[PDB]
Amino acid sequence: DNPNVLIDAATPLFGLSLRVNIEQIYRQTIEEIKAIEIELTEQGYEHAILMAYRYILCAFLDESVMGTEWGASSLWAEHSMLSRFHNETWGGEKVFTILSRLEGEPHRYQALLAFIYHCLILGFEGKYRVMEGGQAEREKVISRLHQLLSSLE
């Protein structure tokens, strides 16, 4: 399949994430995450891959909301996407743990790798946001991942 399939499936959530009735957007986001999962399952995508995808999507959206001024004090902070879908509260470390595993089998996981690259260049920081020297280290991650994607042709 095409390496952009998971990016394509996530485009409504990327737009949604970029502009962040708070209650409203919260609920539409929960519904859309599940709808995307169902759509990709129908297309025959592997459950384990879809759970890694969903995990990263949740962490991405949560970080987008926690970056705002109203985020940490809103209903979203109280019960985040990652908490509702994966029963975890941050995701900032585990996104990169997942990335490292996927990079152990990169041809197999090309589409999810491409998705993670897109998240990174859209500004996802995770653990790098609060790491000393984190901005430079994150740029090294992005450079390595671009090189990997390039080597997968």
Partner: peptide, 5 residues
Amino acid sequence: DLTRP
């Protein structure tokens, strides 16, 4: 499971 530890 890719989302383990």
